[PDB]
Structure formats: structure tokens, C-alpha cells
Amino acid sequence: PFDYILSGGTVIDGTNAPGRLADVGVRGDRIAAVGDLSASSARRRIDVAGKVVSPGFIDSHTHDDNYLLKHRDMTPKISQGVTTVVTGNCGISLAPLAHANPPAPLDLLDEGGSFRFARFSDYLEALRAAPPAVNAACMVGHSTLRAAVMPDLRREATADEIQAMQALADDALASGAIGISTGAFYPPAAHASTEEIIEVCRPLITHGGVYATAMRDEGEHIVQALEETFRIGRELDVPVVISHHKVMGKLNFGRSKETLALIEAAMASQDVSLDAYPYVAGSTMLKQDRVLLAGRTLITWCKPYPELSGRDLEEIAAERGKSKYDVVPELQPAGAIYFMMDEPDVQRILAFGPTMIGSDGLPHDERPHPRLWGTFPRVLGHYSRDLGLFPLETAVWKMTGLTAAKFGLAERGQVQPGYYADLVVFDPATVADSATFEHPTERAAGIHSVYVNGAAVWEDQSFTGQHAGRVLNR
């Protein structure tokens, strides 16, 4: 007999096909059957009439590396219907690195002495021993590797350092990492040459992992950054994932037509993917950058001056008698939200066929960007239902079937017999992001229940206590 059957609802199976009325039966950690299951014995027959049963959402871009360890409930994500998270993005991974004061933006994962894993396997072992509520597909970050190997990061790596980083990268992949990510836009890796990146990532071809990247530049020189990324992809002959695609700065508004055309062209000749979050503001370390600081900027957290959390940087700068750009150094290390994107571009990028959904949430932030709590329902409700940017089955596909395929997460991302029972039950009519910039931690509406490996992790708007997540391998 099945452990339970979610009956009477509409199944959107994650294959980008219109929903159909069907029941979903689960046995253990697997979807046992799909369709009219009235004739199948089940210990429980849960009524989900009026609801949609879809695969659990896979967050293609997270910085939950440490959050998975410190807050196993993973409420910010499971409350949105997320059942799997891809960690170690933008070249930022928790391991391998034993450092009491890791350089920004690595500190976005730190809660105080959090970087205690000398080896990547130690990190994965820790997750398996005390599993989080969601599954985890982990990547190792190039910037973390540089921090672990290089005495001085403000220069290109030497042959010996590249060899040391490549060794760590290979060990990580051998231990279960699903890929390597880079973030050359940031200080720790701004001096890394394209050749350094290629050599450090050589193990990807042997282990069959992916190359993910926060491109070196997403503004005036985004074309050159895109070309570098495509080049690395060809040199490695592995799939590449362009993280949080956008065109930033008023002088680049509307250029998404241009970038998407370049990406579409590259996809015809090589393996290219991309993801994005549904907002016009970004968030990361507070950095001295003319473009990032051109528009409205909010502080998410500040080490030297904790009271600044939540404040407008323009006000802070003005009151200190300096420009936003000049006041940044004295406020570091800190985090911020940057309003430097335009809605039309965000919509164009989200609607672009291949674009996967990634929250890019920064879970440790005192006053976080709302994407941390409302990304997925915002795509399902606001964009799909309310604006009609795409049909619901396509919106679901963009956060389930597509993502599972691109990251190689076998037997997940689809409501199919035999696949793992990562599922979400939501009300298509009411699903919506409740988090706003003003109140960034409000729980989304319309999320009835969430299941991971068959176990309900979210029910009655609360974590059930089921630490059902597993460390996944590609």
C-alpha cells in the first residue's frame, strides 16, 4: 500500500505540459504512481482539490552552504516550496577553508567561525550526519580555493598555487561536489586570469561536473564577460551556467535583448544555461563600485557599525560628508541591496526560454533582500498568473524539470512514477510572494505543503521537524 495519496488536485509534472487532473501516490521516498489512484490502497488519502501538485522547487542559485548546517529547518526555502538547493555559487563555498576572518564576499556565509572545514568531504559529511530539511547539491567555489591557497589574492596565481587549487577542486568533486563556480567580479578573484580558471576547473571533465559563474562584469563590459564564459566552456568542454543574468546600470538598460541573443547563439554550438531572480535589485557584499552604487542602495548588515543595518546608504554617506562610493571603505565589511536593474530586462530574461529560477538569497543577512523568502511564489503568482509572462506549467518547469536536467539531479524535478517524492502542493489562485523590501521575511501565501524524499517538511505553515534532505551527487 502507498504511504499516502495526494488526491483530487491538478498535476503539473515539471515537463512543461498543461496540468491534468490526477492523484499522486507515494511509497517511502518515491512517487509510486500518478493518475486515477482510487483503486490503489493507501494509508492516507489527502484531499488537495483545487490545488496543484508539482515537483519540489529546485533553487538553482543559493548561498545556503552554512545555513543548511546552522538552521536545518531551512524555513526561508521550504516555506516557498523549495525541496533542493544548489550551493557554493559565485565562487563562494563554505569549504574547503579554515579561516577565522574570510575575505568578502565569503563572509556572506559566516556566522562567526563558520569556516571550519579544511576539506570539502568534512563539509559534506557534516550535512549527511545532521541533514537539513532540503536536499543539497553542492559546488566548490574558486574564490574559496584561492583564499585557502594564496597568501596574496591581489595577483594572478602561480603554477604551484594553481596546482594546489586544482588538487582541492578535484578532491571536492571526488567527494561529491557537482561542479565549480567562479565570481571574478569580486576582490578575491578579480586578479584571476581566464587561464587560471580553466586550469583549476580541469577536473570537471573527468568528474562530469558543471561550471557555474557570476560573470566578471554585468554592465558596460558584459559582452566581454559573456565571451570569456563561453570560451571557458569550450576549453573545458563542460556545461556552463550563467548565474543571476542581468544588465546593470541605466546605461545598460534594454541590453538584455543583446545579451540573450548572444546566449541563444552560444547554446546552438555549446552547452550553456542560465538562471535569474525575479527582482530589479541585487544584493551582495558592500563594494566600492560606481555602477553598483549609482542607484538606491540599502545596507543589509554592517560589522563595524551594526546600527546601520536597514539604512539607506545615500543618507549614511551624505551625513558622513561623502559620496556613496567614498564612504564604503569605512563601513566594510558589510552587505547591501542595489537597485540597478530595470523591470523590462528582468521580465525579458525571466521569459527567455532556458532561464532557470534562482533566489540568490543571502540567509544570514540582518535585513535581507526579499528574494530570500519570495522568489518562487513571485514567479508562480505575480509573473505567471497576474502578468501572464508565461503559463503556469512553464513557470513550474523553470524551477523543476529544467533545473534538474541542467544540474544533473537524477530522478528529481518531475512528478513521474519511480522518481523521488520531492513535491509541493500549492494553490495556483493564491500562491504569492509576501516578502517585500520593507518586510523581507514574510512567508509566502498559497503554499499548502512541501515534501522532501516523501516526508512532509512544510505543513500548516510550519516546519514539521523532518530532516529529510540528502546530499546529492551528479
- Residue 255: CB minimum distance to Zn ion, A: 21
Q: In the bound complex, which residue of the shown chain has the CB atom lying closest to Zn ion? A: 90
- Residue 408: CB minimum distance to Zn ion, A: 20
Q: Do residues 424 and 379 lie in contact, with contact meaning Cβ atoms separated by under 8 Å?
A: no
> Where does this chain touch Zn ion (CB under 5 A) — which range of 51-59, 73-81, 82-90, 438-446?
82-90
Report the distance separating Cα 341 and Cα 371, nearest Å: 14
- Residue 170: CB minimum distance to Zn ion, A: 24
C-alpha cell recorded at residue 332: 566594510
Residue (211 or 463) nearer to Zn ion, CB: 211
Residue (90 or 357) nearer to Zn ion, CB: 90
90 binds Zn ion (CB under 5 A): yes
Number of helices (H), then strands (E), in the chain: 15, 24
Report the distance separating Cα 469 and Cα 474, nearest Å: 16
> Where does this chain touch Zn ion (CB under 5 A) — which range of 81-89, 273-281, 330-338, 433-441?
81-89
Question: Site mask, Zn ion, residues 112-151, x = CB under 5 A?
Answer: ----------------------------------------
- Residue 273: CB minimum distance to Zn ion, A: 15
- Residue 139: CB minimum distance to Zn ion, A: 11
C-alpha cell recorded at residue 274: 542560465
- Residue 260: CB minimum distance to Zn ion, A: 20
89 binds Zn ion (CB under 5 A): yes
Report the distance separating Cα 142 and Cα 182, nearest Å: 5
Q: Do residues 354 and 402 lie in contact, with contact meaning Cβ atoms separated by under 8 Å?
A: yes
- Residue 240: CB minimum distance to Zn ion, A: 16
> Where does this chain touch Zn ion (CB under 5 A) — which range of 8-16, 275-283, 359-367, 379-387?
359-367
> Where does this chain touch Zn ion (CB under 5 A) — which range of 296-304, 360-368, 374-382, 454-462?
360-368
3-state secondary structure 8-27: CCEECCCCCCCCEECEEEEE
* Number of chain residues interacting with Zn ion (CB under 5 A): 3
Instruction: Give bridge partners of residue 312 from the DSSP assignment.
Output: 298
The DSSP-derived string for 130-147 is S--SSEEEEEEEHHHHHH
360 binds Zn ion (CB under 5 A): yes
Report the distance separating Cα 145 and Cα 157, nearest Å: 11
Helix (H) or strand (E) holding 167: helix 159-175
Binding site for Zn ion (CB under 5 A): 89-90, 360
